[PDB]
Structure formats: C-alpha cells, structure tokens
Amino acid sequence: AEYFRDEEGQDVLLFIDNIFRFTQAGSEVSALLGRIPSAVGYQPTLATDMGLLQERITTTKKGSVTSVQAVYVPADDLTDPAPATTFAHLDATTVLSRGISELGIYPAVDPLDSKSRLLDAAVVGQEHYDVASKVQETLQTYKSLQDIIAILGMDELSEQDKLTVERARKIQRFLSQPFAVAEVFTGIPGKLVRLKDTVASFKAVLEGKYDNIPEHAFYMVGGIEDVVAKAEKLAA
Amino acid sequence: AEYFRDEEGQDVLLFIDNIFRFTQAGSEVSALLGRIPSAVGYQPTLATDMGLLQERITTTKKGSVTSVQAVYVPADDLTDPAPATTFAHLDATTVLSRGISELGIYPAVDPLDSKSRLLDAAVVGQEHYDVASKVQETLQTYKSLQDIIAILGMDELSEQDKLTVERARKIQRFLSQPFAVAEVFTGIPGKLVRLKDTVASFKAVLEGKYDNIPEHAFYMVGGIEDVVAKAEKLA
Amino acid sequence: ATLKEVEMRLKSIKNIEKITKTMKIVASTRLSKAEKAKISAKKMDEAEQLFYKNAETKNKELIVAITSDKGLCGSIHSQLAKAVRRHLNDQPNADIVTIGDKIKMQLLRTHPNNIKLSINGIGKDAPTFQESALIADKLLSVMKAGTYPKISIFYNDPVSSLSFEPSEKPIFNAKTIEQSNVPRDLFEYTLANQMLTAMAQGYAAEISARRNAMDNASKNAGDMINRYSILYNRTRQAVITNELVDIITGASS
Amino acid sequence: ALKQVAGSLKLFLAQYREVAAFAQFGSDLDASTKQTLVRGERLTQLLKQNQYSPLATEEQVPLIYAGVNGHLDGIELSRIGEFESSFLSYLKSNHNELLTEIREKGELSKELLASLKSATESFVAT
C-alpha cells in the first residue's frame, strides 16, 4: 500500500481483517523470546509494536491512504490491552456489540460507542450534527430507563418518558439495515441508503411525523419510504 | 517525639500525615528489593512494618505521646490492606466520608463508622454515653429507612417513623460545624463547641424540645443556642 | 463492571425485591377491606337502579373522572384517561371534573381548558358517604351541576382479580327524573350515591391492580437477581484469576 | 433448663426476621404479623446486654421464660431494660428458692416451672 501511496502517487484503500491477530501473534511468541509477561500475559512491547505498525498506515503529502481495520475484542472485553491500545490510533470507530446483536438489530453497531472526529458541525453541517446529537440523546435516555422498564414496566413512566422511549425503540430498529452480502443467509434483499436520505429520515422520525407508525415497520428497511411501504403491508 | 517523651518527661503530640505514604513507600522499596509482592502488590512485611512504626508511639510511665494520624484511603476503599492494617492500632477513628460531604454536611465525619475506645460510660459518664448511643440509634434507623424512602418517600411511614426520621435529619445536620480553617471555603465565622454543651444540645434535640425548629436552622451552627438564634433569624 | 459495582447493584436489587414483595402482601391485605366496602356501596346502588328500571329515565355536558393520587397501579390511571379523552374528543364542549391527582394531571396536559374542578387526596382510604356528599355539595354549588342536560361519571370497574374496565355511568338530571321538588333532591341523593359507588369500585380495582403490579415487579426483580448473581460469580472468578496471575508474574522473575 | 425455654425463642426470632420488613407498613398489619412484630421486638430488646456483665444460667432462665411466654407484651419497649434488672432483683429476694433449684438441678421440673410462671406473673403485676 505504501508503494501505491508514495511511488505511484495514487489514492489507496487498505483493508486489514483482523489486525488484532497481529498483536495476538506477537504474544504467542513473546514468552518464547524470554520477555517478562505484561498484563494478562501480553508482550511488554505491545504499545510500540502497535505504534510501528499502525502510524505507518497514514495519509501523507505524497498520497492518500484510506484504511479500514477490523479489531477483534477478546471475550467482548473492550478494556483488554489490545483493543484499548488500538482505540487511540483511529479517526473513526464503529463498535459492534453482542448486546445489540441479540436484539436482532443488525449490523449490531453500538450507536453510543461508535465515534468519529468528523461528526463536527463544521464538517457534517449543523442540521446533520443536530439530528445525530438528538438521536444519541434519545437513545441514552432510553438506555438509562431500562432498569425501571425492566422491573416496573412502561406504565410507571411519565408521558414524556413514554414518548421518548417509543421514539428510541423506533430509532433502534430504524438503525438496522440489510446488507446485500448478508442476503445469502438472512434472506432479506440488500439496501443502500444515501447520506442525505439518512439525515432526512431521522430528522423526520425525531420530529414525530411517524409517531403513529408501529415500530415493527422500521425493522430492516432502507429509508423512511420503505418504512411507509412496510407499514402499508403490515396494514394488509 | 520519643526524645521529648523519654528524656524530658514531656507529654507529646505527634501529628502525622500521611501514614498511607509510609505504607506505600514500604511497598515501593519492597518491590524494588525483589520481594514477592503480596495481595494487591503490598509488601509481605506490611503488618510488621506498621507495627514497628506504630507501637513505638505509646504512653510509657515516663510520658505520653498523643498522635493524630491522617490516613488516605485509596478509591475510598476502607478494605484496602493499608487502611485495614492501620485500623488495628488506633484508639479513636474519625472516618471522613464522601457521601456525607456530598450532602454538604462538613466536616463530613461518618457518625457511625467513626469509633472510639473511650466512648464508655465508665470514662465519659452515663449521660454522654446515652446521648451518643441514642444519636447512633436514630441515625442508623434513618439510614435503614432511606432505602424505602427513596421509593415511597416519607408519606408511607408510620408517625413514629416520620418523627424519628425528621429528628434524625435535624441531628445529622446539627453535627456539621464551621471550622476557622474553613473561612477560605466558607464565609461563616468559625466556632468551637464545648463537650458539655454538645451533650446538652444533642440531648435537647433527642428529647424533641426543638421539634418546632426547621431543619436548616441546624446547618453549620454551633451549639443549640446558635440553633435558636438562626431559627429566629430565618423567621 | 468491578466486583464492588456488581455487589452494590446486586444488593440494591435484592432490597427492591424485598420492598416489592412487602407491598404486594400489604395490598393483598388491604384488598379485603376495599372489597367489603365495595359490596356495601354496590347494594345501595342496586337499590336505586332497581327504581330506575321502572322509571326508565333517559337523557353542554359534565363528566366526572375518579382515580387516586398515587401511582404504581399499572395503568389504572392511563386507561381511564384514554376513556375520558376519547369520549371528550367527540364533544369538546363538555366540562370535566377530575377526582385524583393522576387523572387530573393526565387530562390537564392534553385538554387543559375545560377542567372545572380538581379534588385531591380522597383516594387514600376506603371512600365514605361523607366525602361523596361533600363533593356533591361542592359540585352543585361551585360547578353548577344542576344546569347541565347530561352528566356522567367515569371509573374503573373491578371486572376480575386480574383486570378492570373503564366504565361510564349516567347521572340523570332532575329534568330527566321529573318525567320520562322531590325530583331535585332525588337528583342530589342519586348523585352522591353514584359517586360513592364509583369511588368504592375504583378503589377496589386500584388496590387489586397495585397488588398485581407489585407481583410483576417482584418477578422481574428476582430475574434481575439471577442475572446479576451469575455476573457476580463470573467477576469473582475473574478477579481471583487476574490477581493470582499478577502474584505469579512477580514471583517467577 | 435453658434448652427447655429457649427452644421456641429460635422460632419466634426467625418469624420476626421474616416479618421485620412490615414494620414500615404498620398502617395495615395482619394481626398475626402485628403480634409477631410486637413479640420479636421485645425478645430482641431483651437479648441486649452490657459489656463485662455475664449472667448466671438461673438468671437467664427467668428472663427468657418471661420473654417467650409473652408477659413482656404489656410492658413498654423503652423500659424492657428496666424490667430485667428489676425482675431478677425481685426473684433473688422473693423466689430465691427457684433460682437455687435451677442452679443446683439444672432442669425445670413441671412443678418448678409452674412456680416460675406464678412468680413471673406476681412480678409483672407490679
């Protein structure tokens, strides 16, 4: 990729699945090299091996490298030294979670642990920033209440909390999307949603225009038009 | 301190802060010397190091060495081996609590976790002991009822429970005191309350002679006289 | 998720389980008192509906909604709120009187202007003819009950040990009693009796509903306790293993 | 002698431990729970004891007998501590035969038990 970047002067994509295996592999040999084990048995050189591999993957004035790295998370432990060390090296992160997957909400991306430096009002625009921030506020409000909803149930919430939880559930299901490559085993045709369409759809949802639509209509549909169409089918 | 005790016959005060630093430095030197670390990394010799330090500080027949020892509690965990080892050597423990401080009740001593060897009717007299014991009972009952009040409020409680909770709240706020040193953290002039007046005041509050006083009159006041004065000032 | 975090959360949920179970039993005990008061009022209401079965009386509008002030009932308030809302939307000219802070709140937020009067605090103990009569007097004097061609009251009927039904009952005006000053005072008397019966039935339904709600809460608390007990065991084993690994690493150099 | 009377103390304290949560809901207590609470509170209050003040077995037996058999129910809780020290001082001046017999024999014979009941009621009346 570096030869394409610096010598051919091209733009480059560099996919790496799964970069965690680079760290793990080192640990496998570290004990044989005679080093004192670090925390949870990792090699002492974890941070600098990561640095030497990782910030060598970078855009430079000679060329542009877009890099997408899949990072495995042992035992779903995001605090494990390897994922924790990898977090510092990335501009955009998306955190797939088992808790979201168990709900059937694929692609299972955690909407409150995904992060990006481009989600900035000067970059995405004020409308997109406002929509994203309000979506996250709604989801966080819903997540906070899940203890009360679990024990006491929806009935004891205030009417504003009930409305917010309804919109949060609908937003959760609306963030799910069917990929084409998954059609082999999901059986659901793949959908692709544009950025403007996504922002408009979630802006409409937060404005309450679709408060009447049952949440089931939002599951696995590519955009609000498909939400309306699926609501029509659910009505027949 | 030992020279003042043994060679001059003085009564001595040995203020120490911070004992946790003695323990932590012992841990660092132990680790550097290559001793196998003990639980949570403390040195194997923790208990005997603490003993050698502490029980040199004692009242021999030549003179008394009083000592006040500030102990940092990492992560507020009193079960950590360092505070746990320190506790065994002390005659009086004044456990400061973050929870009490977040209520705004300074100096934020935990009224229940703080304990004294001398809180005995043979030492302080039966009246003082009775007042202290009743204060502890009231505060512990209030703490137990808080678990229910957090859900159902005070409305569901019996009238006896309501009365005891209200007196407990008054007592809890009455334990606060404005220190002179705190005049950078507060504008309130500092005050010093005698032991006898403290016993009399808490007896008066326990007996309900000031049930008619609003709770805020007990905050950061001195003796019960200041309670009366502040209650009138509010009114 | 430190071991102390899991311990604190587990103990808190255990406390909640105890509280909910205690409330469930207390409501079970209070339910019999509520039920016998309900029966007593029910027969007194039957005594007049027998008469109306012969008189065959039939009808701006006035609606009285009856609930208590306190929650944890499991939709006791919201179902009646929905009933009153969907009735009112067909005739928004009707004024409404709210008995109970919860129904007051849930109507005020959506139909604010037409609430004439709110009665509070009377849903605590089993209702008395004293409360019903005084409320009727205030309704006549202040809310001008006699001026309306239609009056009806809304409450929760104790259909079953596990369910209740939002129900409406008409209070036929003196003009309707007169044909189909005795009719006037008979109106006042039947107003008080119907309101008392509605309060008693709503009280029985609310107590039963709160019992069932606390039962559900105790079930859920037990399930959460199981989940976090499993999590506590996992964290205990993990903590022991990690600290032992640290000790072994310190020893093996 | 202590086994004879303390056998049911365990049961009553266990019931009290199960029912304790109801004290904060006294507005509606099943009569069983109310009486259980009333008895368990006084039993727990009776088991309080000052430091360095060990009691002889024949001094424990009358106290636990009175507590278990409900004679304390008519006594205000706040003065249970006054009851105990008083009751013993009564026995050791009015029924010292019973204390001596309990110490010597170590058992509550039926007639001795009835005499203990009579003494307990003779005291509680004043």
Short mmCIF file of all heavy atoms in Angstrom, two decimals, chain A residues 195-217:
data_model
loop_
_atom_site.label_atom_id
_atom_site.label_comp_id
_atom_site.label_asym_id
_atom_site.label_seq_id
_atom_site.Cartn_x
_atom_site.Cartn_y
_atom_site.Cartn_z
N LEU A 195 -26.58 9.43 2.27
CA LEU A 195 -26.36 10.23 3.48
C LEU A 195 -27.49 11.24 3.69
O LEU A 195 -28.04 11.35 4.79
CB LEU A 195 -25.01 10.94 3.37
CG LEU A 195 -24.67 12.00 4.42
CD1 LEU A 195 -24.68 11.41 5.81
CD2 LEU A 195 -23.32 12.63 4.12
N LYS A 196 -27.84 11.98 2.64
CA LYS A 196 -28.91 12.96 2.76
C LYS A 196 -30.22 12.29 3.14
O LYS A 196 -30.96 12.79 4.00
CB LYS A 196 -29.08 13.72 1.44
CG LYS A 196 -27.84 14.46 0.96
CD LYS A 196 -27.31 15.45 1.99
CE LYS A 196 -26.17 16.27 1.43
NZ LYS A 196 -26.63 17.30 0.45
N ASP A 197 -30.51 11.15 2.52
CA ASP A 197 -31.73 10.42 2.85
C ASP A 197 -31.72 9.96 4.30
O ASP A 197 -32.75 10.03 4.99
CB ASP A 197 -31.90 9.23 1.91
CG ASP A 197 -33.23 8.53 2.08
OD1 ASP A 197 -34.13 9.12 2.73
OD2 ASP A 197 -33.39 7.41 1.57
N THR A 198 -30.58 9.48 4.79
CA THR A 198 -30.49 9.05 6.18
C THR A 198 -30.78 10.21 7.13
O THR A 198 -31.58 10.09 8.07
CB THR A 198 -29.11 8.46 6.47
OG1 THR A 198 -28.88 7.34 5.62
CG2 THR A 198 -29.00 8.03 7.92
N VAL A 199 -30.12 11.35 6.90
CA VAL A 199 -30.32 12.50 7.78
C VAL A 199 -31.77 12.96 7.73
O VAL A 199 -32.38 13.24 8.77
CB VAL A 199 -29.36 13.64 7.40
CG1 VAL A 199 -29.63 14.87 8.26
CG2 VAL A 199 -27.92 13.19 7.56
N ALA A 200 -32.35 13.04 6.53
CA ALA A 200 -33.75 13.46 6.41
C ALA A 200 -34.68 12.49 7.13
O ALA A 200 -35.60 12.92 7.83
CB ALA A 200 -34.14 13.58 4.94
N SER A 201 -34.46 11.19 6.97
CA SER A 201 -35.32 10.20 7.60
C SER A 201 -35.28 10.33 9.11
O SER A 201 -36.33 10.36 9.77
CB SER A 201 -34.91 8.80 7.17
OG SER A 201 -35.05 8.64 5.77
N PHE A 202 -34.08 10.42 9.69
CA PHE A 202 -34.01 10.50 11.15
C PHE A 202 -34.51 11.85 11.66
O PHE A 202 -35.08 11.91 12.75
CB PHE A 202 -32.59 10.22 11.62
CG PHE A 202 -32.25 8.77 11.65
CD1 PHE A 202 -31.66 8.16 10.56
CD2 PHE A 202 -32.53 8.00 12.77
CE1 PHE A 202 -31.35 6.81 10.59
CE2 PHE A 202 -32.22 6.66 12.80
CZ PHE A 202 -31.64 6.07 11.71
N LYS A 203 -34.33 12.92 10.89
CA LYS A 203 -34.92 14.20 11.26
C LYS A 203 -36.44 14.09 11.30
O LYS A 203 -37.08 14.61 12.22
CB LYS A 203 -34.48 15.28 10.27
CG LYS A 203 -34.79 16.69 10.71
CD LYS A 203 -34.16 17.70 9.78
CE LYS A 203 -34.43 19.12 10.24
NZ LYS A 203 -35.83 19.53 9.94
N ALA A 204 -37.03 13.43 10.30
CA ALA A 204 -38.47 13.25 10.28
C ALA A 204 -38.94 12.41 11.46
O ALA A 204 -39.97 12.70 12.07
CB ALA A 204 -38.90 12.60 8.97
N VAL A 205 -38.20 11.35 11.78
CA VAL A 205 -38.59 10.49 12.90
C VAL A 205 -38.55 11.26 14.21
O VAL A 205 -39.45 11.13 15.05
CB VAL A 205 -37.70 9.23 12.95
CG1 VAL A 205 -38.05 8.40 14.17
CG2 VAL A 205 -37.88 8.40 11.70
N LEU A 206 -37.50 12.06 14.42
CA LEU A 206 -37.40 12.80 15.68
C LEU A 206 -38.45 13.89 15.77
O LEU A 206 -38.87 14.25 16.88
CB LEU A 206 -36.00 13.40 15.83
CG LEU A 206 -34.87 12.42 16.11
CD1 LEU A 206 -33.55 13.16 16.05
CD2 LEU A 206 -35.05 11.75 17.45
N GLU A 207 -38.89 14.44 14.64
CA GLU A 207 -39.96 15.43 14.65
C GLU A 207 -41.33 14.82 14.91
O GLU A 207 -42.32 15.56 14.90
CB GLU A 207 -39.97 16.21 13.33
CG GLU A 207 -38.81 17.17 13.17
CD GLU A 207 -38.82 17.89 11.84
OE1 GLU A 207 -39.77 17.70 11.06
OE2 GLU A 207 -37.86 18.65 11.57
N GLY A 208 -41.41 13.51 15.12
CA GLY A 208 -42.67 12.88 15.47
C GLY A 208 -43.63 12.69 14.32
O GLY A 208 -44.78 12.32 14.56
N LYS A 209 -43.19 12.91 13.08
CA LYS A 209 -44.09 12.76 11.94
C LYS A 209 -44.61 11.33 11.83
O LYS A 209 -45.73 11.12 11.33
CB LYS A 209 -43.38 13.18 10.66
CG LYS A 209 -43.04 14.66 10.62
CD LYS A 209 -42.53 15.10 9.27
CE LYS A 209 -42.34 16.61 9.23
NZ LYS A 209 -41.89 17.10 7.90
N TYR A 210 -43.83 10.35 12.28
CA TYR A 210 -44.20 8.94 12.19
C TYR A 210 -44.45 8.31 13.56
O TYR A 210 -44.24 7.11 13.73
CB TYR A 210 -43.12 8.16 11.44
CG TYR A 210 -42.87 8.70 10.05
CD1 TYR A 210 -41.77 9.50 9.78
CD2 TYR A 210 -43.77 8.45 9.02
CE1 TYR A 210 -41.55 10.00 8.51
CE2 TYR A 210 -43.55 8.95 7.75
CZ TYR A 210 -42.45 9.73 7.50
OH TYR A 210 -42.23 10.23 6.24
N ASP A 211 -44.90 9.10 14.53
CA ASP A 211 -45.24 8.55 15.83
C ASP A 211 -46.34 7.50 15.73
O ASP A 211 -46.42 6.60 16.57
CB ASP A 211 -45.67 9.67 16.78
CG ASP A 211 -44.50 10.47 17.31
OD1 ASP A 211 -43.37 9.96 17.28
OD2 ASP A 211 -44.72 11.62 17.74
N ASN A 212 -47.20 7.60 14.71
CA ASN A 212 -48.29 6.65 14.54
C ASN A 212 -47.85 5.32 13.96
O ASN A 212 -48.57 4.32 14.12
CB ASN A 212 -49.37 7.26 13.65
CG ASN A 212 -48.91 7.45 12.22
OD1 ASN A 212 -47.93 8.14 11.96
ND2 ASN A 212 -49.61 6.83 11.28
N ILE A 213 -46.71 5.26 13.30
CA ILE A 213 -46.27 4.02 12.64
C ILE A 213 -45.85 3.01 13.71
O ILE A 213 -45.11 3.38 14.64
CB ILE A 213 -45.12 4.31 11.68
CG1 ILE A 213 -45.55 5.32 10.61
CG2 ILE A 213 -44.63 3.02 11.03
CD1 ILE A 213 -46.67 4.84 9.72
N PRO A 214 -46.28 1.76 13.63
CA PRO A 214 -45.78 0.76 14.57
C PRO A 214 -44.29 0.52 14.39
O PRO A 214 -43.77 0.56 13.27
CB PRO A 214 -46.60 -0.50 14.23
CG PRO A 214 -46.95 -0.33 12.80
CD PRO A 214 -47.20 1.15 12.65
N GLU A 215 -43.61 0.27 15.51
CA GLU A 215 -42.15 0.14 15.47
C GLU A 215 -41.72 -0.99 14.55
O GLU A 215 -40.65 -0.92 13.94
CB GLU A 215 -41.60 -0.09 16.88
CG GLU A 215 -41.82 -1.49 17.43
CD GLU A 215 -41.45 -1.60 18.89
OE1 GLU A 215 -41.23 -0.55 19.53
OE2 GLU A 215 -41.38 -2.74 19.41
N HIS A 216 -42.54 -2.04 14.42
CA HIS A 216 -42.15 -3.17 13.60
C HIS A 216 -41.88 -2.75 12.16
O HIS A 216 -41.06 -3.37 11.47
CB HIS A 216 -43.24 -4.25 13.64
CG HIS A 216 -42.88 -5.50 12.92
ND1 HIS A 216 -43.82 -6.42 12.50
CD2 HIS A 216 -41.67 -6.00 12.55
CE1 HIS A 216 -43.21 -7.43 11.89
NE2 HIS A 216 -41.91 -7.20 11.91
N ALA A 217 -42.55 -1.69 11.69
CA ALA A 217 -42.36 -1.24 10.32
C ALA A 217 -40.95 -0.70 10.07
O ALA A 217 -40.52 -0.64 8.92
CB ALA A 217 -43.38 -0.15 9.98
#
